[PDB]
Symmetry: C3
Subunit: 90 residues, 3 copies
Amino acid sequence: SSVQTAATSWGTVPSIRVYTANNGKITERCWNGKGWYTGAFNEPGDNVSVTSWLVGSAIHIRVYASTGTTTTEWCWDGNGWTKGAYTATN
Amino acid sequence: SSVQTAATSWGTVPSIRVYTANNGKITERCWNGKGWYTGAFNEPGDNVSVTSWLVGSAIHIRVYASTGTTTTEWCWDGNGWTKGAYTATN
Amino acid sequence: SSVQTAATSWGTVPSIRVYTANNGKITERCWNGKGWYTGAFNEPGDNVSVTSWLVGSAIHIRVYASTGTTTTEWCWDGNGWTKGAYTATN
Ligand SMILES: OC[C@@]1(O)OC[C@@H](O)[C@@H](O)[C@@H]1O
Ligand SMILES: OC[C@@]1(O)OC[C@@H](O)[C@@H](O)[C@@H]1O
Ligand SMILES: OC[C@@]1(O)OC[C@@H](O)[C@@H](O)[C@@H]1O
């Protein structure tokens, strides 16, 4: 029942995103330099990891959400969260 | 009872920090290019994530320590660990 | 029994590595811009974290694999995975 988190950051301000898996739901809190706020990410899962990279000033984020033995990748590329092509055999 | 870790690194040497949550306590091991040693970070929690960024040559670290459903952010900005402004409703 | 993941990425394409701890075994899935494939990393553990850094164009990866209270570091420096010098007292 205890929460599990993952975190990523970019830039120098910086921007931070913290993902929390709690009771089967993953949610997102965001910092862009002045106050924490709730992000758009809402996906099911009991376990989360994240990585991100910049292309110029454009951030790209990949969140790996797992339920049971099944991992789904979620992608932020500037215009909403979409399901990514990641697969694994678990 | 099994330990859970989080890791971050910066630079090219590199510097590495590995955080271990074990039996409700989070501790830190450090590498700055020649030998592992114990860091100053000691905070309670059963779950840990971390992110870091450089501003010039100055490292900034954020550790997200969770106990139950409560997440506390700890901040390294060059002069000791301090509690950060992160909040979430879990 | 549920899987736990860790992820790292580098570059702008980017390269991504996702490590999955499942039933005591850690495995690796890789993206280098066009298709996911299975990486060379295979090590025991119930918990995984990862960090990576570039020296020029050369990637270096450290995977922290934990079983029980024992953490082993695995190193990629361009020519196969090797056990690293990390130790901790847990
Ligand atoms: O500014 C917040 C936001 O747009 O940042 C990018 C992603 O983290 C989104 O989920 C999030 O809502
Ligand atoms: O050189 C070690 C150290 O000062 O590095 C910065 C932080 O990781 C501290 O907790 C740690 O003790
Ligand atoms: O191209 C894939 C690969 O060589 O990339 C570097 C490491 O992630 C290896 O485990 C992996 O097999």
